[PDB]
Amino acid sequence: RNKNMSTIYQTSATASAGRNGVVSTEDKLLELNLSYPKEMGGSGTATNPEQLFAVGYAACFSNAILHVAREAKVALKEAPVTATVGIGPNGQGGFALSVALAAHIALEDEQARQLVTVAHQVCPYSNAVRGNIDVQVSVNGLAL
Template structure:
């Protein structure tokens, strides 16, 4: 693979109760363990950062495949839900649900676009076979 861009971030402090900063300082955050995992909460956590990155990346992939098929993705939204829990082997694992709103696209066509985006999205390709990723097309609101 020819690398087109490389991002770099550094974690300091106590891992999940520490601090992260990208090399260009565009992202700089304190981290805290979520209350649900026994921490204090009140700051970002790695799962939120992963969810934000996956949602943005998947949305870009979705818009790319939509352009190719000339689909109208006006008003499209991608929400990534990232869960963490014990993996049964002494460690932890992640599970992802991608919830996609495509209000201007008929449901079966929307599902096809989402499936196609899942094949080209770098996050989807990186996680495939490693974590469960569920794809959900949200029902359009009744007019």
């Protein structure tokens, strides 16, 4: 489930001032300023690793749903996904993420459900956090 058996795509990024400086892909396709959010005492003038994870997870899960749709020959124009990410202490000295994913799919409900369930199985963010984060997944307003 967890082994990447043959790398199809590889990328890299470098940061040096943690949550409060610049971060960029080594190809420079993506170059971003980061700052602490207001909730953490910062300026909120820029993004942060929690928002990045939300953006990337929403995008990965949306890609995943469209992937499965293509494979099932289901014509889906869009697969909007809202990802909500929280961060707090884990009580052992570190920090942990909590995640909710809300998918909105123009299909009959049982069908949408099946599709999104398979997508959650195949999505590499989902495989990455499986058993660590209990990702709360819903499809068209209903929890899976």
